[PDB]
């Protein structure tokens, strides 16, 4: 591949100028070894002071790996890169990937390094390996090949990728392969034993066309909108009924015909919170009607690819996290819950960081894009620590919730 | 002649679509012209500048200035216009090391690389943009026109291009001599080592021999400064460091400017002088642009200034960094939302100190502020030492565990240990998770008229207790909090409180221990006095008894 595909930024937009955040000595040393080798292989080159652009870089360890790996925060450059009608009018997102029994994700990021980057755009991929305590100037590089994490890399490589895969795709009409950034999502409907073969069969097929031995295994048959459920009790205290009425009042923003007044009439008077109240039959009926309403799907919920996906996360305690993906309030496209984050029973931020990555992976598989996160955490705590637990080669956007939402109760 | 390597040229462009400067040359006096001709003739003989023809259309004005006793003229070429039209550069000298991160060095020499600066060539295709004109005597001949062949002093790209060229020249010498450090600042290169001073001077002229490859003369710095080094506001001694002397002026009349230049010295001194506090003297700074305003000191402002100068009475120093020892950071609460910290490796020998002030909020608590301080120190330490320090914090391990397991936000602080240094950060109240059996249940509500600001707040309970209080100059949100306050006031040690105020519940669920609002503060003080409080929320106007009953009582 000698020829360059011409790329440029959006109109009236300069290249990124994002400050590099401080790094630990061991991450700096890891990056120095990684970049020295990349320089010898010609993937990157030293740049001079005539390049004022910058994109942040740090070091990562991927799932079950002891090798340091470099990750570039290309979020700004991706925003500023020309909108890619990626060799096409676009590929329709494989709606069938989200319905196949198992999905295996493969890091095919190395394939990018074998195709060259447009000579005029390389300047915009500039990054800095920072020094400690400003004791030397930062080491300044730019890319010569398609870098991992860049919007243009999957687009530019799509012609070669679709060619590499066609023999395997021609053999298997039932395997659905999807590409998002540096990752290949391989989803079949056969059982695990032959599934690890056919990904190894595709794996082994790739190396012949010019890797990482690695993978991740998903099961999108699960991914629904978790129903709202009400308690089933033989004796209701005043407090129980007050919570039920609150939850039903909230649910009535989502569901039509939710009624509360028969349950409200159980609370005639000024009663102690712990006093048991017997349900009337009109209140039992009303509670029953509410139960039936809550088992239907919500009306008029549709994905609009012109709007952002929004993901909210609530810390529920004891390693449990609830989350909802939507585009407009109360029209949940997907809800879920996580428990016992592996290797983090003592670290809230590690758990939250793993939840963000899981939710983003589900969002890629369902809609082919990442959601905008609303994180229950102060900006300064998240910003200090998330890079320590990040393991994906993409990075989504996030905002911070500083007021405790009342609705954490309702997803309990 | 011994061949010398060329210093590789940096390509330079103007800002896109922008052209070079076209500024008129000022008229000068005959004595200034004569001075500029002599000055420019010598730089021309040294290659710095070159004469050009009349085709070049660009121009940048020249000046001649004097000094007090220095009875000589000196050229000034005003590149303000060319700088506005020159591309942005990678300015790679913005950050400067902090002394607490530096390891000690047995020996340090200083070389002057001033002459080296002029052997860095300016990009050939860009020189036309640096053209300037010496006006002629009596304006009777064409003015002498020159352009630069080297980086001009005062031009936008000169510092970045110069330091980049030196760094590239120095890179192989540093890499092949790992037992020395080399640091650039101005026209001076600092070389430190830990080897015996004989091996040091050999490495030094080994470096000069290396610089000769590109033909750069580098003698020792004239009038060699004995320690301490006076550099970026510090005093670098061979084994200790401190800031340059902090002397706090004596004044009967403090103005905005006299006030804001003290906090500067205080902020600068807070990196080594422990316990510096700035809030009260800072507070007088909240909103004024007239810097001559004489605003009196509160006697909390006088107390902390006096509290300062007692800390500034004797000089104190930081130690330099030893990578073989652990890095430890200790924090103290000081009151009114400010915190101090010390970072050290061995007890009583601080690397540096510092302080943290609370973020401007309506409500807050000590644990959140301590957490913020921890993150700031964490980030500072990664900057200075490339690692997170071990923390010593004045909060009990059980207090932190209770806080983060129950707080609605995700939170984390790195490896730390309790240090019993009062005052201790603590949680001041904890709401119940379940209603309290046997405790009185207070149904509270408040309401206000948006126009007349008249309102009511009150409660009704299961034991028939009731109260409604009329209020003036109030809001809906205020009466809702006042209703909760009355219930706390009038209940025993254990109490269930039922509110429909999402506003009140959002404040209390944030767990503040102090507020801008005295009403919230009064509620906090009530919560501290209780043994158990269960706070329940219901939606308003759904006929929830107790809440329906009190809602009618307080709504007009
Ligand atoms: C080497 C150096 C010098 C300066 C001075 C500027 C001025 N004006 C600044 C920096 C950032 C330097 O850069 C590094 N400095 C250090 N350590 C220092 C070296 C100096 N000592 C003070 C001292 C020691 C010995 C003598 S003596 N006995 O020779 O007279 C006199 C003074 C304090 C610590 N470490 C590193 C590591 C990587 S860069 C770098
Ligand atoms: Mg009301």
How far is the C-alpha of A258 from the C-alpha of A249, rounded, in Å?
8
A residues 258-277 closer than 8 Å to B (CB): 260-261, 264-265, 267-275
Residue nearest to atom 15 of ligand 1 (CA): B102
Question: What is the separation, in whole angstroms, between the first and last Cα of chain B?
Answer: 103
CB B308 within 8 A of CB B248: yes
Chain B, residues 144-183, CB within 8 A of chain A, namely 157, 160-161, 163-164, 167, 181, 183
A139/A118 Cα distance (integer angstroms):
22
Strands in A205-354 per DSSP E: 216-218, 236-237, 276-277, 310-317, 320-326, 332-338
CA–CA distance, B234 with B13 (Å, rounded to integer): 38
- Rg of the Cα trace of chain B? 34
CATH homologous superfamily for B228-321? Reverse transcriptase/Diguanylate cyclase domain (3.30.70.270)
Cβ pair A58, A27 in contact under 8 A: yes
Query: Are B228-321 and B322-428 the same fold in CATH?
Result: yes
Q: Are A313 and A374 in contact (CB under 8 A)?
A: yes
Inspect the interface and report whether the beta carbons of B538 and A133 lie closer than 8 Å: no
Any idea which ligand is nearest the CA of B548?
Answer: 2
Domain ranges, ordered by start, for chain B: 1-92+118-158, 93-117+159-227, 228-321, 322-428, 429-556
Q: What phi and psi values does residue A150 have, to the nearest 5 degrees? A: -90, 140
Q: Which residues have any ligand 1 atom within 6 Å of their CB?
A: A 135; B 97, 102-105, 107-108, 181, 183, 185, 190, 192, 227, 229, 231, 236, 238, 320
SS3 B332: strand
Separation CA A18–CA A302 (nearest Å): 36
Q: Which of B92, B100, B26 is nearest to B59 (CA)?
A: B26
B197 touches chain A (CB under 8 A): no
DSSP state of B227: S
The answer as to CATH 3.10.10.10 being correct for domain A6-95+121-161 is: yes
How far is it, in rounded angstroms, from Cα B393 to Cα B346?
17
Q: How far is the CA of A273 from the centre of ligand 2 (A)?
A: 19
Comparing CA positions, the residue from A359, A355, A412, A365 lying closest to residue A389 is A355
Q: Which of B386, B413, B497 to mutate to test the interface with A (most CBs of A within 10 A)?
A: B386
Structure tokens at B85: 């039209």
Using the Cα atoms of residue B523, residue B527, residue B533 and residue B535 in order, give the sign of their dihedral.
Answer: positive
Cβ separation A349–B460 shorter than 8 A: no
Name residue, tokens 């309990």.
A412
d(CA B120, CA A407): 65
Number of helical H runs and strand E runs in chain B: 14, 24
A50·B87 Cβ contact <8 A: yes
B534 pairs with which residues across the strands?
A: B496
CB A401 within 8 A of CB B510: no
Q: Which CATH architecture is the domain B93-117+159-227 placed in?
A: 2-Layer Sandwich (3.30)
Looking at 2.40.30.160, 1.25.40.10, 3.30.70.270, 2.30.110.10, the CATH number of the domain A218-303 comes to 3.30.70.270
Instruction: Look at residues B441, B461, B506, B462 and name the one whose alpha carbon lies nearest to residue B480.
Output: B506
Nearest CA, atom 24, ligand 1: B238
CATH architecture label of B322-428: 2-Layer Sandwich (3.30)
Could you give the CA distance from residue B337 to residue B366 in angstroms, rounded to a whole number? 8
Transcribe B291-357 into DSSP letters. Answer: TT-BPPPPHHHHHHHHHHHHHTSS---EEPP-TTS--EEEEEEEETTEEEEEEEEETTEEEEEEEEE
Burial class of residue A194, CB neighbours in 10 A (0-12, 13-18, 19+): exposed
DSSP H helices, A309-370, are 348-367
Selection from B447, B511, B461, B519 nearest residue B490 by Cα: B461
Distance CA B548, CA B496 (A): 17
Superfamily of structural domain B1-92+118-158: HIV Type 1 Reverse Transcriptase, subunit A, domain 1 (3.10.10.10)
Say yes or no: A320 contacts chain B, CB-CB below 8 A.
no
Could you give the CA distance from residue B539 to residue B499 in angstroms, rounded to a whole number? 8
Taking an 8 Å cut-off on Cβ atoms, the answer to whether A274 and B498 are in contact is no
Q: Which helix (H) or strand (E) holds A383?
A: helix A379-385
Residue B504 CA, ligand 2 centroid: distance in Å = 13
Contact with chain A for residue B43, Cβ under 8 A: no
C-alpha to C-alpha distance for B373 and A318, rounded to whole angstroms? 26
Give the side-chain half-sphere CA count within 13 A for B236: 22
Over its C-alpha atoms, chain A yields an Rg (Å, rounded) of 25
CATH no., domain A304-412: 3.30.70.270
Upstream peptide bond of B228 is cis (omega within 30 degrees of 0): yes
- B435 in contact with A, Cβ within 8 Å: yes
Is the separation of the CB atoms in A382 and A313 below 8 Å?
Answer: no
Residue nearest to atom 13 of ligand 1 (CA): B183
Name the token pair of B468: 């409604």
Residue B161 has a CB neighbour count (10 Å cut-off) of 25
Nearest-Cα distance to chain B for A229, in Å, is 19
* Identical topology for domains A6-95+121-161 and A96-120+162-217: no
CATH architecture of the domain formed by B429-556: 2-Layer Sandwich (3.30)
Taking CA atoms, A194 is separated from A191, A216, A342, in Å, by 6, 16, 27
- Among B430, B494, B493, B496, which Cα is nearest to B459's? B496
**Chain A contacts in chain B segment 229-248 (CB below 8 A):** none
A149, A107 Cβ separation under 8 angstroms: no
Render the burial of A114-138: b for 16+ CB within 10 Å, e for the rest: ebbbbeebbebbbbbbbbbbbbbbb
Other Cβ atoms closer than 10 A to B201: 12
B-proximal residues of A, 352-371, CB under 8 Å: 352
Our CA-based measurement puts residue B38 at a distance from the nearest CA of chain A, in whole angstroms, of: 34
Residues with Cβ within 8 Å of residue B433, at least 6 apart in sequence = B534
CATH of A96-120+162-217, one of 3.30.70.270, 3.40.50.2000, 3.20.20.70, 3.30.30.10: 3.30.70.270
Structure tokens at A40: 């010898």
Give the closest of A137, A242, A270 to B460, CB-based. Answer: A270
**CA B551 to CA B93: how far, in whole Å?**
65
Residue with tokens 């002093």: B153
- Ligand 1 center to B103 CA (angstroms): 8
Can you tell me which residue has the tokens 């201790």?
Answer: B424
Which ligand 1 atom sits nearest the alpha carbon of residue B185?
A: 6
Within 13 Å of residue B37, how many CA atoms lie on the same side as its CB?
Answer: 12
Q: Which of A239, A376, A404 sits opposite B506 (nearest CB)?
A: A404
Contact status, residue B174 vs residue B20, Cβ threshold 8 Å: no
Answer yes or no: are the C-beta atoms of B12 and B123 closer than 8 Å. Answer: yes
**Interface-testing mutation among A377, A381, A386, with chain B (most B C-beta atoms within 10 A):** A381
Residues 6 or more apart whose Cβ sits within 8 Å of residue A76: A16, A18, A55
Q: Is B279 in contact with B338 (CB distance < 8 Å)?
A: yes
Q: Domain-by-domain residue ranges, chain A?
A: 6-95+121-161, 96-120+162-217, 218-303, 304-412
Instruction: Give B353's strand partners.
Output: B342
Backbone dihedral angles phi then psi of residue B533, each to the nearest 5 degrees: -130, 125
Measured at the CA of A242, the angle between CA A241 and CA A247, to 5 degrees, comes to 95
Give the residue carrying structure tokens 């006006």: B135
């Amino acid at each position: 591949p000698i020829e360059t595909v011409p790329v440029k930024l959006k109109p009236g937009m300069d290249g990124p100028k994002v400050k590099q955040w401080p790094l630990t000595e061991e991450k700096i040393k890891a990056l120095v070894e990684i970049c020295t080798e990349m320089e010898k292989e010609g993937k990157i080159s030293k740049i001079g002071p005539e390049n004022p652009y910058n994109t942040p870089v740090f070091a990562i360890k991927k799932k079950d790996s002891t090798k340091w790996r470099k990750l570039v925060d290309f979020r700004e450059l991706n925003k500023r890169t020309q909108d890619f009608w990626e060799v096409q009018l676009g590929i329709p997102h494989p709606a069938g990937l989200k319905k196949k029994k198992s999905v295996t994700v493969l890091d095919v990021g190395d394939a990018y390094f074998s195709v060259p980057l447009d000579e005029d755009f390389r300047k915009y991929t500039a990054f800095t390996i920072p020094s400690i305590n400003n004791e030397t100037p930062g080491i300044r590089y730019q890319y010569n090949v398609l870098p991992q994490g860049w919007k243009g890399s999957p687009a530019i490589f799509q012609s070669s990728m679709t060619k590499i895969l066609e023999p395997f795709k021609k053999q298997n009409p039932d395997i659905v392969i999807y590409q998002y950034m540096d990752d290949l999502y391989v989803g079949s409907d056969l059982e695990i034993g032959q599934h690890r073969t056919k990904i190894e069969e595709l794996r082994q097929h790739l190396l012949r066309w010019g890797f990482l031995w690695m993978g991740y295994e998903l099961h999108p048959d699960k991914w629904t909108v978790q129903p709202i459920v009400l308690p089933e009790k033989d004796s209701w205290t005043v407090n129980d009924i007050q919570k039920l009425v609150g939850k039903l009042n909230w649910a009535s923003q989502i569901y039509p015909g939710i009624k509360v007044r028969q349950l409200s009439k159980l609370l005639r008077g000024t009663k102690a919170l712990t006093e048991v109240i017997p349900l009337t039959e009109e209140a039992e009926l009303e509670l029953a009607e509410n139960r039936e309403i809550l088992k239907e799907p919500v009306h008029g919920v549709y994905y609009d690819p012109s709007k952002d996906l929004i993901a909210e996360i609530q810390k529920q305690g004891q390693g449990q996290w609830t989350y909802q993906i939507y585009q407009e309030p109360f029209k949940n496209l997907k809800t879920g819950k996580y428990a016992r984050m592996r290797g983090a029973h003592t670290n809230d931020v590690k758990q939250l960081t793993e939840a963000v990555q899981k939710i983003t992976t589900e969002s890629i598989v369902i809609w082919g894009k990442t959601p905008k996160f609303k994180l229950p955490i102060q900006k300064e705590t998240w910003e200090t620590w998330w890079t320590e637990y990040w393991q994906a080669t993409w990075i989504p956007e996030w905002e911070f919730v500083n007021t405790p939402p009342l609705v954490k109760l309702w997803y309990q | 002649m011994v061949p010398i390597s060329p210093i590789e040229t940096v390509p330079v462009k103007l800002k896109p679509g922008m052209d070079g400067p076209k500024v008129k040359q000022w008229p000068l006096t005959e004595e200034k012209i004569k001075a500029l001709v002599e000055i420019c003739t010598e730089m021309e003989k040294e290659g710095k500048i070159s004469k050009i023809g009349p085709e070049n259309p660009y121009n940048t004005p020249v000046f001649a200035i004097k000094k007090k006793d220095s009875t000589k003229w000196r050229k000034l070429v005003d590149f303000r216009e060319l700088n506005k039209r020159t591309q942005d550069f990678w300015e790679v000298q913005l950050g400067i090391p902090h002394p607490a991160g530096l390891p000690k060095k047995k020996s340090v020499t200083v070389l002057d690389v001033g002459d080296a600066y002029f052997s860095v060539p300016l990009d050939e295709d860009f020189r036309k943009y640096t053209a300037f004109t010496i006006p002629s005597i009596n304006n009777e001949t064409p003015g002498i026109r020159y352009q630069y062949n080297v980086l001009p002093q005062g031009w936008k790209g000169s510092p970045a291009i110069f330091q980049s060229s030196m760094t590239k020249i120095l890179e192989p010498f540093a890499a092949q001599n790992p037992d020395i450090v080399i640091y650039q600042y101005m026209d001076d290169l600092y070389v430190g080592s830990d080897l015996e001073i004989g091996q040091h001077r050999t490495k030094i002229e080994e470096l000069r021999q290396h610089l000769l490859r590109w033909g750069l003369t580098t003698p020792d710095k004239k009038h060699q400064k004995e320690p301490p080094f006076l550099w970026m506001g510090y005093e670098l001694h061979p084994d200790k460091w401190t800031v340059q002397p902090i002397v706090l002026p004596e004044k009967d009349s403090w103005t905005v400017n006299d006030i804001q230049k003290l906090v500067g010295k205080l902020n600068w001194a807070s990196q080594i002088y422990p316990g510096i506090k700035v809030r009260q003297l800072s507070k007088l700074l909240r909103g004024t642009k007239a810097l001559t305003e004489v605003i009196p000191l509160t006697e909390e402002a006088e107390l902390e200034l006096a509290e300062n100068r007692e800390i500034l009475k004797e000089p104190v120093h930081g130690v330099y960094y030893d990578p073989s020892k652990d890095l430890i950071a200790e924090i103290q609460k000081q009151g009114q939302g400010q915190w101090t910290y010390q970072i050290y490796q061995e007890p009583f020998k601080n690397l540096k100190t510092g302080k943290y002030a609370r973020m401007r909020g309506a409500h807050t608590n000590d644990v959140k502020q301590l957490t913020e301080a921890v993150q700031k120190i964490t980030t500072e330490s990664i900057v200075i030492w490339g690692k997170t320090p071990k923390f010593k914090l004045p909060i009990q391990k059980e207090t932190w565990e209770t806080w983060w397991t129950e707080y609605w936000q995700a939170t984390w602080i790195p490896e730390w240990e309790f240090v019993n240094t009062p005052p201790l950060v603590k949680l001041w109240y904890q709401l119940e998770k379940e209603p309290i059996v046997g405790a009185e249940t207070f149904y509270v509500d408040g309401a206000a008229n948006r126009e007349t600001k008249l309102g009511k707040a009150g409660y009704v309970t299961n034991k028939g207790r009731q109260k409604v209080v009329p209020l003036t100059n109030t809001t809906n949100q205020k009466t809702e909090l006042q209703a909760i306050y009355l219930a706390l006031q009038d209940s025993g040690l254990e109490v269930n409180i039922v509110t429909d105020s999402q506003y009140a519940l959002g404040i209390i669920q944030a767990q503040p221990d102090k507020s801008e609002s005295e009403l919230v503060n009064q509620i906090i003080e009530q919560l501290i006095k209780k043994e158990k409080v269960y706070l329940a929320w219901v939606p308003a106007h759904k006929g929830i008894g107790g809440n329906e009953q009190v809602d009618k009582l307080v709504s007009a």
